[PDB]
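Section: Multi-chain targets

For targets with more than one molecule, the full set of components is provided together so that the structure can be written out for the assembly as a whole rather than chain by chain. Components appear in the order listed by the source. The example entry contains 14 components.
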Amino acid sequence: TSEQWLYWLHLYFWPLLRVLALISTAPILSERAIPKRVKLGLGIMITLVIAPSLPANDTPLFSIAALWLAMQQILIGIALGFTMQFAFAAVRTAGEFIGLQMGLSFATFVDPGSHLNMPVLARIMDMLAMLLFLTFNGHLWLISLLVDTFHTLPIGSNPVNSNAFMALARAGGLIFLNGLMLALPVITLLLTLNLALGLLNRMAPQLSIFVIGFPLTLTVGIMLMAALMPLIAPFCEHLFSEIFNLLADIVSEMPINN
Amino acid sequence: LDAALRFQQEALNLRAQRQEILAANIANADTPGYQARDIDFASELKKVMVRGRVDLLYRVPDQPSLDGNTVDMDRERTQFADNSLKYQMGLTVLGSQLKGMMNVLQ
Amino acid sequence: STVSFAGQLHAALDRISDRQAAARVQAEKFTLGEPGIALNDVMADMQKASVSMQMGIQVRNKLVAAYQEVMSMQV
Amino acid sequence: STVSFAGQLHAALDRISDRQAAARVQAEKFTLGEPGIALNDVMADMQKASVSMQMGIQVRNKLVAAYQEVMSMQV
Amino acid sequence: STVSFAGQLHAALDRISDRQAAARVQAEKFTLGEPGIALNDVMADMQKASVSMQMGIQVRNKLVAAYQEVMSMQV
Amino acid sequence: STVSFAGQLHAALDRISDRQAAARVQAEKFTLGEPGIALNDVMADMQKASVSMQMGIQVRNKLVAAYQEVMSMQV
Amino acid sequence: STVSFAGQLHAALDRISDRQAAARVQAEKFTLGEPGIALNDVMADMQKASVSMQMGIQVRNKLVAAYQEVMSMQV
Amino acid sequence: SWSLSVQTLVFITSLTFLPAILLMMTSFTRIIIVFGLLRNALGTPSAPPNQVLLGLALFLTFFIMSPVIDKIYVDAYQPFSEQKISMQEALDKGAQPLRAFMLRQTREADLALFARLANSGPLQGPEAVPMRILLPAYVTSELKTAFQIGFTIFIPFLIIDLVIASVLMALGMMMVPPATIALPFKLMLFVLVDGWQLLMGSLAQSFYS
Amino acid sequence: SWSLSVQTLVFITSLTFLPAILLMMTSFTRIIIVFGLLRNALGTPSAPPNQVLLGLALFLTFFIMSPVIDKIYVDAYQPFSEQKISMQEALDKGAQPLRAFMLRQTREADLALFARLANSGPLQGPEAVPMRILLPAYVTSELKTAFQIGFTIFIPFLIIDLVIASVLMALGMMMVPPATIALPFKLMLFVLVDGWQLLMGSLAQSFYS
Amino acid sequence: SFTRIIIVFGLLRNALGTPSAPPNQVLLGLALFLTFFIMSPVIDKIYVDAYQPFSEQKISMQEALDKGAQPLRAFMLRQTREADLALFARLANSGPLQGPEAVPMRILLPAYVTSELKTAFQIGFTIFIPFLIIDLVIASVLMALGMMMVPPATIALPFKLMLFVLVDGWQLLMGSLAQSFYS
Amino acid sequence: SWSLSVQTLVFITSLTFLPAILLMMTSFTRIIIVFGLLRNALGTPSAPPNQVLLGLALFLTFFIMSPVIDKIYVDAYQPFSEQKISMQEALDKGAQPLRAFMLRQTREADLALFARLANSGPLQGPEAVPMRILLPAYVTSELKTAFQIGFTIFIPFLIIDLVIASVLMALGMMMVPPATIALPFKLMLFVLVDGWQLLMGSLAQSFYS
Amino acid sequence: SWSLSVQTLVFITSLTFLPAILLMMTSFTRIIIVFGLLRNALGTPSAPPNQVLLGLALFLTFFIMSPVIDKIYVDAYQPFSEQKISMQEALDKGAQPLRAFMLRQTREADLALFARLANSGPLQGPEAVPMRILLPAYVTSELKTAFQIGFTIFIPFLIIDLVIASVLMALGMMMVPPATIALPFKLMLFVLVDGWQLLMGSLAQSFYS
Amino acid sequence: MTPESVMMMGTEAMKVALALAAPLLLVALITGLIISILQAATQINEMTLSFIPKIVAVFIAIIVAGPWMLNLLLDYVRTLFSNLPYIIG
Amino acid sequence: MTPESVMMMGTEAMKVALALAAPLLLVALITGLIISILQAATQINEMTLSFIPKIVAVFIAIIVAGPWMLNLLLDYVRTLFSNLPYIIG
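Its structure, encoded as tokens over all components, is:
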């Protein structure tokens, strides 16, 4: 219990720091609903299971010259959790743009301090994707990849290489790509509807989409997205797997590149 | 309330009074015809507990002396030592009650 | 009849004040040499006054903590 | 039936209170001059009562800290 | 094999308890009238046991402080 | 005349400061070996100065708490 | 020149540091056994350095609170 | 009886449990929820929560609970002062008016749920409910009542908002923000009705029906 | 009297109760509510909340209360200097000017509400009202006054918004955000009128008349 | 317990618009009472098999621990998602586990907290879905009528409140949590 | 003088009162309100409030205050460093230059209003106004000046909005949303004119003229 | 040097200044403004800034400052570790690469203004300018550059808006809302050309040049 | 509080809403109808020629309806807050 | 407060708004009507052919009416704020 331990209690601190970074940044782990004590205790109580079989020996220098080590762990956590947010942003884009088609957002068109559309359709699909994530192996693969980072990039004087934050920067990237690739059928069908009801204006310029168009397009959008709700379930697979691969890639890109 | 210290407080006051009585005994251990006095601690304590805020009984003498004096010094020495010890005990008991009451509090 | 918590607080503070006044006047009356008053009673009364004042302080602290915790929430 | 947290705390407080009351009765008897009771028993029992009350106070502090730790967090 | 520092704390507590129990049984045996055991030996072992117990208490205090501090980092 | 809160605080702080200056001068003269000044006077005056300063500390702390509670109000 | 908040603050922190260093050198020489230095000198200067440290810490806390209050108002 | 041991040890802890449990046992749940919801209507906060609404709710709850406090006073305190009552008989003497007061406000179905999920055996009468059952049931009933009051308060300001919006865009003012036009009308409506008296009086009188 | 214990024990706790009860029993409720409502008009914050509006309000209410505080000084602080007065008659001596001020500001029927709901007995005169009934009455009446002032504040900027939108609509401007054009004109109307002086001064005048 | 319940309450307050329920007091207190009612059987079994024997005879802080742990272990195992144990056994380098009992505390705790988080969020998002339905319908109706930029959140909030009170919301929620918490 | 008690007591309290009262007493009010209003134009916020505009405003006010703070330094910090001045004449020696600075910006009539609502007697010269009068007058004058600068800033972007709208209507853009069309043109106008340089320069040159 | 005192004051306080001062000292201002502006085009947010855009800017600025952080590491973290360089030459050696980085992006007349209003005398060379003058000048220059980049990004989406509106209105679609038609076209332009990689690469290249 | 009660409250609210918005909406509709009837038959038209007539119509209607719509709204609001305590059970 | 007084303030506000807007709406409607009359008699048109005439008319009106409009608005608002204290009761 002395420093014969209490500097071997320096075995817990760095892995705890990395696990805590991931928890504070991860998609499900870092939700404001969880009491802060639960997240902290989960970090401590994961590292206690992972800390043995982690041969770590460093020093919390006074006026830390090894804070650049602490940085390292924090950064790796930011790598793992935050990137997994891209998969949600995608749908939080897709569904949002779907509203931007029907009628829901003409307040956001010509000008304000109130957006009012984030509550409407983006939070439908984003929490639907929340559940799709969790239902696997959602909560867990992030933690397993964190342990894998412990084993591939444990603790070192060369923590992070350049040319490797572009990977995450131009990664999304696939935020726009996948948001589209999901919302494309709905957008295309409502484009057809909008152009058709516009062509009605050729027979009579009085038909006034404000009067005719919006009630039609709202029903079309609601019914159609009801019909194309299940299409998300396969897409989320993609939407997570590829991003995992990216993380996996960078996690396994870093050791052979160091 | 706060009459939970009343018993030991009145006991300690009666102990002080008995100290005064016994010191008077020692002082007048030579005056002719003194007829040494005392008080019954138990009875006076009960009397002050039942009603609140002390007859000077006469210590029954042994060994006459022709000066009328009846202070038999050995009895007075033993009783004075006993009273002093009981007074210190009362001090310790009151101290413990007040320590406890102020320990529970802060 | 009605309680008027301010009235109970005033009563408690008056009880503490009068107890301390009794102790202070008895110390006055002892160190001034008046007969009667004994040192044991003086010390006991001083200690009782200290305990009552400490109880007042602790009750104050709990009431103030309660007030500031009720007033720290959002309507 | 149950653990009855309220009942358990009541039982503990009763144990402490009856211990102190019995010690005070023993001191009552000794100072009043009853034979039987001895000085060494009086002091030992009063010290044991002090220990039990101190245990109660420590448990009180830990439980109050626990309760206030639970009630501070957001929901 | 493994250290499992909760096991180290258990070992420390067992050491403290065993030392106090040894001192207590030595006082037991001596006051019982058992020949052999000396008075200075009894008192010295009681002294050492007291120091070890305060060792344990100080370690307790600092571990509780450390835990109450690691539960304050915001996450 | 008028109130001028600032003037009242200025006067209170001058009172605290010159009370302490009197206590400091008393200590100066006593330690320098002058007639008159007694050790009871020095100790009592130094304690009075400490009590007055502590009262100032408490009043300041409550004023600062009130200020930072008033100007954390959301308009 | 000008008030030079950076240069002024640097000079103040240097004053704190060199007072601590002077106290530490004095204590070093005292415990090494070097003649001269008296014990009261060591204790008094160590406490003076500690008070300088505390004043610096309080100034820092107040300035950090001020900065974080100013840099949080919505514009 | 207790002997200045546990007494004044249960007093201080009673005071530490005061601010949460006792203030959320009596009222000041309903009052605070209703004021918060009222403040969502009528536009922005526009009233210093931790300053005026909390204090007004404290005064209101004092007045509402005053008969309960007087009954507790007369039946518990003075009999507890010096004679025939000491902190066990005092407990039921001081609880009985409070338990009756909370029973009168509980939904007649929350007690059912909490008694059935606490394995409680059949209940003979209103007096057989244990405090353990009656606290959370009262809390849930109080939350329901507060939200009911909340919608009923929202209604007229919803009326103002919708009528202003309809008039504006019917007149052709297609995209002038109706909240900005409406906010003075919300305040006007709530001041001509003398909204604060109606609200606090209705809350108080609802809280004993 | 009290003895440098409970005296200086009531003092520190009084300073604890200061920031809420004392700043919301005198003024600074009407003023801060008017300032916040004014800030809802004219668009965005345009004045840092915790700093300039709050500080300006604190100064302003000190300035309104300076006569009442002067009378409280004369009737409490000067005599409380060692002589004939110590925190027993001093209490109501220092209350009376403040009670007179609050009564002079309260609604003549909020007193009725908070009296009738307190089971209070019939009142002979203004002096017979207690602080108990006086506080919530003053708070509620002050909220009414603040909302009346706020409605009057929202009037002219409502006028500007409507006239701007109507001009745009007549010119055929189907989809222009009239708020964007109207905001500089809101400030316009608020500076040529010299709005800050007028509003600060009118609050002060309304507060005693 | 008291993580799942408290998370569900927090999410429920995320819906229904504004919080307007005093967290430090009412939701915390209700969650604490509800978790006590849930654990009355577990607490009873721990008491009967530890405290009565740990009191003065044949058990003292040596078998007290496992006698009091077995009930808590059984309760925790009955609640764990079956895949978290897999992860934490596969990362603790522990070997194959023959039965339900074979999992130790060092494995049981992180799996239990992860499973509790998962269950709490499944419940909480299922609770959101109807209130976002209300947002959808009200926004779409306002847009259909052409109410250009009327702020649909303000209109939705009272409708969310009656949605949550006509459906007998608080009783149904507390009852569903208690039922789900032993199934 | 003071004796290292109240010294280092009033120092720490002065530090606590720094962020709010001192900053809203010297400058950084005009600057920050003008930055907020410029942010209102040009479309969305599109510049982080909590970090960058606050930092730039702090730097601007430091640069503007450097003559004032240098006078305060030469008049206190040298002569307060151990000789003939110890935090009694330090206060007024330091206040005088700041007082002159604040007087140089106060509107001629705000002082009048706040003096007339203090019942202060006649004043002889600018040296006769006390800090009590001088704080709120300076604050109100600063708000007026900030709003005037706000007009001068909104003018050109209002021109762009209206000219884009008029072109779009004449061309026959039935209901194109001209705001999205005008935002990049607003940014273009503000970058070619070199608007950040010349804006902060204009504020600075305005602020002491 | 400093003595177990101030060290771990200046460090913890520097960590306190980190998020605002140090992040807006280097980058993440230009990137964040450009990202927000790009979000203004393409319609609504559709990118959760609290979740994604801020982190993307954070990663991008890490990449951007990899060279300056590498040079800082070489100049300080090797020598300053345990030997021969102690927090005085370390400070200037570690200031040199960041200061060159900022000076390389600052418009050559921002520094002019901020020197002419700090009353700084002659500045001998580019290295002679202090951080006092370098900070606000760098911030203003970076704001200019961010607005330029945002304007260029607005160009093509403005073109798409006007061409789509023109097609709709010419083909006879009298009064269709061209914005909802244009939004998917905005996406198509932005994804077919692989727009994100182009944007981050162009920013990265232009940031140091 | 059964859904019958909430529907009753909602129907009351809707009819008082139409009562409060009846004159202004109806005169706006009437002025639009009149200016459109005049719009053809001399089919001249630019876009509106009708916004200003609607403005003055709403002006006069607010002056005329005026008192009673505000009084009817006040009656509904005061009645609703007054029966607030009784609708719970 | 009484509803009589709020209606009084409201009508005063409506009449100052109407006086404030009268030149602009007046000239807009006049020029629109003139171009609509001339719309026939060469019935050629694209949509309006009146937008620019309306804009130049409102330019002329804001220049020539101008100062009295702003003076009337300022006097109204100054009087409103001046008598604000006296309307509470």
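Residues 1-258 of chain A form one domain.
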